[PDB]
RNA sequence: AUGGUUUGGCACCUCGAUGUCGGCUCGUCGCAUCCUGGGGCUGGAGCAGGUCCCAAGGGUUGGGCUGUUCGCCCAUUAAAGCGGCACGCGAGCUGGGUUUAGAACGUCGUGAGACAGUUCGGUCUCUAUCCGCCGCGCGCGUCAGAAGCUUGAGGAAACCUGUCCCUAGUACGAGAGGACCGGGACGGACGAACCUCUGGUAUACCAGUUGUCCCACCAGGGGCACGGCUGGAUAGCCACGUUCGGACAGGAUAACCGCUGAAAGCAUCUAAGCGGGAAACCUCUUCCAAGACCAGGCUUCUCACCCUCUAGGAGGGAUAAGGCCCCCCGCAGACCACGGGAUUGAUAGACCAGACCUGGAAGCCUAGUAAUAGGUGCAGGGAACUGGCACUAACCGGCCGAAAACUUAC
């Protein structure tokens, strides 16, 4: 993977092990009129598209009656820390079917 | 569309001269002793006795 | 991506339930309206006792889009519906209450009142 | 292996699959077959990977081969001598020899055979 | 105007100090050796010729080997010329001098020149962005053809019709160099530079910025 | 007075056939300029206009109604220009209107029938010879044969614009209002390159599953049903994605503002002269370009061997540098061409490993009456991407391919 020597310099360690299906809360730093605060996004990891540095994962949450999906680069410095709450039991690598399920049907088994 | 006019002999011959065949190149090979010409594409097969030589 | 003849739910309490996009303001022959864009819209569905009426030509701002929208830091935000909030010429909501989350793009577009009124800004 | 860049061999993908499986069956049954040069060119990697499955001969590999070969005598030979014969050779189980063009349609012919050195 | 010959490696992702993402194309600005000086008194124009790439000495034909020997350097695969403006500018190069990646600095604006990818025989829809005709409402076998060609009954020259597309030298202007890695002789150029991976490119200081 | 863009008039042109309106697709030209650019007087305080000169570089929206052009309207916009070219464009498309045969209404006619009145329905043929144009080769030429790198005469492409922030709430103005000049950021539309991201596609990828047949049977699989149907899906191609672009600067100018002054003792931007002055022009940016017959330049390599006629020239043969064919291929490609490799080899395939996609293989064991679940086990399977590896194929090989001299000057 020829570009690996370039890649490893910016690669970020301390990243927890997690898979599609787990429920995580992502600590995302934001800018609100030129000051810092951490906004926590708690939801279900529905996908993870491996790319090394370009690895991305998607967290889906239900908030005030509307579903929201957020995609973050795995090694983004804009994420100060990821914490995994529970481990989910799923049979797929990408949980796109959850976009059509609400409440009782949208629950995930626990490992 | 249909040809509006009959081609003259010069134009017909000039275009017709491009429809031709090229001569394949031949290399020498020794099969059963006697030398004979074979295309270089078939050299290994001739050395293995896989092409009929009349 | 919202364009002409597209329908949006209303995230306000103005009595309008659903609007149809007429124009995307912001330059001639502009095509799509993302989060934070102002559109000219007509009310298709309304609450029977509300202040607005069907067929009113109003100005609205898009606060949610189904198509994911890239951000500066390489992250993406995607919602489950296209929603708009009816505004007046001074960029303030005509309603008094905003429903559902909104995007961060309303900050750089100077929709401070909508941002403050929203339940949560993503 | 690498799928064909151009149009398929038999005139459709399913026909090409059947063609390749039959050609591999005949190749393992006889040891050498004569066919058009594109057919041998497409046949090489396919037969080579079937032989690779046969080399590490387990039940799992046997079933992997059977889901393509469909002929049980050929599978038995492949897992009884062809596999063990190539035990200590790493790739290049087949060779292609170009032969004289066909008469009916001037199709380039080629002969594909297993190495026995 | 500085310049160097390089090779396109691929594109990747980096983050600057404001945490924004920068899509960067990696260019192997490998070592170049100056082979010839073009002077106004001799050639009529001032330019410098650079050699790049590594090639086996048994692959170069005799004329090329003779030229490299006359220069005094071992042969390289690729040769190209950099056109300067005046003798005062070309006085700073001399034959056998080696140019490496650090002639550029971080944040500099560069001009990358390469050969575009080949697209083959392309229709007007793809070659020229022609809008098509209707796919229904009675349109008969005209879903992609140009249409009209438009007194003298003559198709004027320059007709934007179908033909071969791609494979042309292309210059992209005002690209920013995000980082100059001196250890590997690699330039990290923000943006997309022409050509396929492994192709030859020329990196020059921007003429505009 | 212009024009033949409007109805005309003539009947010169065609009845052994010149498609009739709009619309779509694609243009090209004019300037009588809609925006952007430079101006001037203002019945111009500033803002904003009015009107007028220069200016054709680019741009000039999406819908409702109607077959429509036209037109009215709805939202915008910097603006929603006017025209020529068979009122451009049917061997490019449409057939809604008009313009055959069917039928009805109103009106006319005793009637057959009729109506530059209405209404519903109603076959749009063709394998491109030549010119033209877009691309691609073969031959020959450029005074020996070749090979690298190039100059460029000459052409082609591109040229759009808004909002906001500082200057400045100042100049002006009773106030309201509202600046010039100059810097910065973010946009819309258009164009190009690219595939890191997002998203699309995926007919030799992985998994689930219905009906049926087969592999003797169970298990495990396979063929067919749009790839049977579904869930995903790396590479390539792509846009809905990413990145970049329109410049800056110089020269000569238009309208115009001027300087220095004659004829014409003053005056006069003028007849001598000299300056400023625009998106137009020439350069500048990008690309093609020596078939540029004035067929260019800088270099580097080979730089020699026969035979025949008759020794004048020619013809033939064999070679060098080099090239081509055959061969292995390519993200190069209709073919051809182009590019790379050819055993002194990593060019392709295989093999090993990784990356990635899928998602927990088979067998066995355990639990359950069974459906089924757990362990062995980030398992098994696998294409394109990357690195190793001569195991297989690039082969004991053919064809092309190098010099009359003379004149003058030095």
- DSSP secondary structure string for all residues of C15-39: SEEEEEEEEE-SSTT---B-TT-EE
Residues D47 and D29 sit within 8 Å (Cβ to Cβ): no
DSSP for residue D79: I
* Helix/strand/coil for C7: strand
Return the biggest CA–CA distance within chain B: 62
Cβ-Cβ pairs closer than 8 A, A with E, add up to 26
Dihedral sign of CA atoms C28, C29, C34, C39 in order: positive
Residue B2: Cβ-neighbour burial (10 angstroms; 0-12, 13-18, 19+): exposed
Chain F positions within 7 A of any protein Cβ atom are: 24-28, 60-63, 74-80, 85-86, 88-89, 91-95, 126-136, 146-152, 156-157, 162, 187-199, 203-204, 215-216, 220-225, 227-228, 231-234, 237-238, 240-247, 285-288, 297-302, 321-323, 325-329, 331-334, 341-342, 344-345, 349-352, 354-363, 378, 380-387, 389, 391-399
**Nearest Cα to E26, choosing from C30, A39, C119, A2?**
A2
Structural domain count, chain B: 1
Q: In angstroms, what is the C-alpha Rg of chain C?
A: 13
Q: Which residue of E has its CA nearest to A2?
A: E9
Residues A94 and A47 sit within 8 Å (Cβ to Cβ): yes
d(CA E113, CA E203): 7
Measured from the Cβ of residue E73, the count of other Cβ atoms closer than 10 Å reads 15
Q: List the CATH number of the domain containing C3.
A: 2.40.150.20
Breaks (C-N over 2.5 A) in chain A follow: none
Number of C-alpha atoms within 13 angstroms, CB side, residue A86?
13
CA of E180 to C1' of F183 (A): 31
CA C96, chain centre distance (Å): 15
d(CA A8, CA C14): 53
**Separate counts of helices (H) and strands (E) for chain D:** 5, 3
Cβ-Cβ pairs closer than 8 A, A with C, add up to 45
Nearest Cα of chain A lies from the Cα of E124 at a distance, in angstroms, of: 36
E32 membership: H or E segment, kind and range: strand E32-38
- Domain positions in chain D: 1-117
Q: Do A3 and E15 touch (CB under 8 A)?
A: no
- Looking only at the bridges linking them, the beta strands covering E3-15 and E21-28 are antiparallel
d(CA C69, CA C85): 19
d(CA D43, CA D110): 11
Residue D115 touches partner B, C-beta closer than 8 Å: no
Spatial neighbors of E33 by CB under 8 A, at least 6 apart, are E50, E51, E73, E76, E96, E97, E98, E99
Nearest nt to the B41 alpha carbon by C1': F326
Give the neighbours of chain A: at least 3 Cβ pairs within 8 Å.
C, E
Structural domain count, chain C: 1
**Nearest Cα to E174, choosing from E144, E127, E208, E131?**
E208
Q: Do A66 and C80 touch (CB under 8 A)?
A: yes
Q: Give pairs for C16-23: CB < 8 Å, separation 24+.
A: C16/C43, C16/C45, C16/C46, C16/C47, C16/C50, C16/C52, C16/C56, C16/C58, C16/C86, C17/C45, C17/C46, C17/C47, C18/C43, C18/C44, C18/C45, C19/C43, C19/C44, C19/C58, C19/C60, C19/C84, C19/C86, C20/C44, C22/C57
Q: Which of A1, A5, A6 to mutate to test the interface with E (most CBs of E within 10 A)?
A: A6
E41 membership: H or E segment, kind and range: helix E40-43
DSSP for residue C108: H
d(CA A28, CA C76): 13
Residue C62: Cβ-neighbour burial (10 angstroms; 0-12, 13-18, 19+): buried
> Residue C19 to residues C5, C23, C111, C115, E139: CA-CA distances in angstroms?
10, 12, 20, 21, 35
Residue E57: Cβ-neighbour burial (10 angstroms; 0-12, 13-18, 19+): exposed
Residues B37 and B46 sit within 8 Å (Cβ to Cβ): no
d(CA C41, CA C54): 11
Q: Which residues of chain C make contact with A73, given a CB cutoff of 8 A?
A: 74-75
d(CA E57, CA B9): 56
Measured from the Cβ of residue E121, the count of other Cβ atoms closer than 10 Å reads 9
**Nearest Cα to C53, choosing from C18, C88, C84, C15?**
C15
First to last CA, chain E: 11
- Looking only at the bridges linking them, the beta strands covering E47-52 and E78-83 are antiparallel
d(CA C20, CA C44): 7
**Nearest Cα to A72, choosing from A101, A34, A29?**
A29
d(CA D39, CA D47): 12
Residues counted in chain E: 209
Residues E114 and E159 sit within 8 Å (Cβ to Cβ): no
Residues A7 and A53 sit within 8 Å (Cβ to Cβ): yes
DSSP for residue A52: G
DSSP for residue C121: B
- Domain positions in chain A: 1-111
Residue nearest F127 (alpha carbon to C1'): B1
Spatial neighbors of C27 by CB under 8 A, at least 6 apart, are none
Residues C63 and C24 sit within 8 Å (Cβ to Cβ): no
Nearest Cα of chain C lies from the Cα of A76 at a distance, in angstroms, of: 8
Dihedral sign of CA atoms D59, D61, D62, D64 in order: positive
- Looking only at the bridges linking them, the beta strands covering C83-87 and A79-86 are unpaired
- Give CA angle at C34 (C33, C39), nearest 5°: 40
**Nearest Cα to C72, choosing from A36, A30, E175?**
A30
d(CA C33, CA C41): 12
CA E64, chain centre distance (Å): 23
CA C75, chain centre distance (Å): 22
**Nearest Cα to C42, choosing from C71, C81, C84?**
C84
Write down the architecture of domain D1-117 according to CATH.
Alpha-Beta Complex (3.90)
Residue nearest F25 (alpha carbon to C1'): E147
Could you tell me the residue range of the domain that residue B20 belongs to?
Answer: 1-54
Residue C48 touches partner E, C-beta closer than 8 Å: no
Could you tell me the residue range of the domain that residue C100 belongs to?
Answer: 1-122
Q: Do E12 and A73 touch (CB under 8 A)?
A: no
> Residue C117 to residues A61, A66, C12, C82, E72: CA-CA distances in angstroms?
21, 17, 10, 18, 76
Residue E13 touches partner C, C-beta closer than 8 Å: yes
* CB burial string E26-35: b at 16+ within 10 A, e below: bbbbbebbbb
CA of D19 to C1' of F361 (A): 27
d(CA E82, CA E207): 13
DSSP for residue D3: P
Beta bridge partners of E26: E10, E188
Residues counted in chain B: 54
Backbone angles phi, psi at D11, to 5 degrees: 105, 0
């Amino acid at each position: 993977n020829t570009l690996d020597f370039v890649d490893q310099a910016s690669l970020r360690d301390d990243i927890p092990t997690f898979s599609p299906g787990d429920t995580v809360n992502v600590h995302v730093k934001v800018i609100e009129g030129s000051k810092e605060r951490i906004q926590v996004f708690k939801g279900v990891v529905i996908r993870r598209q491996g790319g090394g540095i370009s690895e991305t994962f998607t967290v889906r949450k239900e908030s005030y009656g509307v579903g929201v999906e957020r995609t973050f680069p795995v090694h983004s410095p804009n994420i100060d820390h990821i914490d995994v709450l529970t481990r989910g039991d799923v049979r797929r690598a990408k949980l796109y079917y959850l976009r059509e399920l609400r409440g009782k049907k949208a629950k995930i088994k626990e490992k | 569309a249909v040809p509006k006019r009959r081609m003259s002999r010069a134009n017909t011959r000039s275009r017709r001269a491009q429809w031709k065949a090229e001569a394949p190149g031949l290399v020498t090979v020794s099969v059963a002793g006697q030398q004979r010409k074979v295309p270089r594409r078939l050299l290994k097969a001739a050395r293995l006795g896989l092409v009929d030589l009349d | 991506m919202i364009q002409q003849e597209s329908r949006l739910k209303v995230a306000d309490n103005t009595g309008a339930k659903e609007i149809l996009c007429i124009r995307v303001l912001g330059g001639s022959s502009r095509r799509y309206a993302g989060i934070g864009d102002v559109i000219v819209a007509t009310v298709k569905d309304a609450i029977p006792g509300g202040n607005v009426k069907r067929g009113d030509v109003v100005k609205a701002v898009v606060v949610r889009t189904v198509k994911e929208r890239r951000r500066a830091d390489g992250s993406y935000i995607k919602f489950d519906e296209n929603a708009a909030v009816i505004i007046k010429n001074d960029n303030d909501p005509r309603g008094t209450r905003i429903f559902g989350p909104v995007g961060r793009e309303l900050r750089e577009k100077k929709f401070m009142k909508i941002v403050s009124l929203a339940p949560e800004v993503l | 292996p690498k799928p064909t860049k151009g149009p398929r061999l038999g005139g459709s993908s399913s026909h090409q699959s059947a063609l390749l499986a039959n050609l591999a069956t005949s190749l393992f049954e006889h040891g050498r077959i004569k066919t058009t040069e594109p057919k041998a060119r497409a046949l090489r990697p396919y037969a080579e990977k079937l032989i690779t499955h046969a080399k590490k001969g387990a039940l799992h590999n046997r079933r992997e081969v059977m889901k393509k070969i469909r002929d049980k005598d050929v599978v038995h030979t492949l897992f009884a001598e062809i596999g063990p014969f190539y035990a200590d050779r790493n790739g290049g189980y087949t060779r292609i020899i170009k032969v004289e063009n066909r008469k009916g349609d001037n199709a380039p012919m080629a002969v594909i055979e297993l190495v026995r050195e | 105007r500085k310049g160097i010959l390089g090779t396109k490696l691929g594109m990747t992702q980096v983050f600057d100090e404001n945490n924004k993402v920068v899509p960067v194309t990696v260019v192997k600005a490998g070592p170049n050796v100056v082979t010839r000086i073009r002077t106004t008194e001799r050639d009529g124009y001032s330019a410098v010729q650079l050699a790049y790439g590594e090639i086996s000495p048994r692959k170069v034909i005799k004329p090329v080997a003779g030229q490299f020997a006359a220069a005094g350097v071992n042969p390289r695969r690729h040769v190209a010329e950099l056109r300067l403006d005046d003798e005062a500018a070309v006085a700073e190069y001399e034959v056998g001098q080696e140019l490496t990646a650090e002639i550029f600095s971080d944040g500099a604006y560069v001009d990358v020149t390469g050969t575009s990818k080949g697209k083959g025989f392309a229709g007007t829809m793809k070659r020229h962005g022609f809008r098509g005709q209707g796919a229904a409402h009675g349109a008969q076998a005209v879903h992609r053809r140009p249409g009209s060609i438009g007194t003298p009954g003559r198709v004027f020259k320059g007709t934007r019709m179908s033909g071969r597309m791609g494979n042309d030298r292309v210059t992209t202007q005002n690209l920013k160099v995000h980082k100059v890695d001196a250890e590997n002789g690699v330039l990290l150029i923000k943006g997309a530079i022409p050509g396929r991976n492994g192709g030859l490119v020329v990196v020059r200081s921007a003429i505009k910025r």
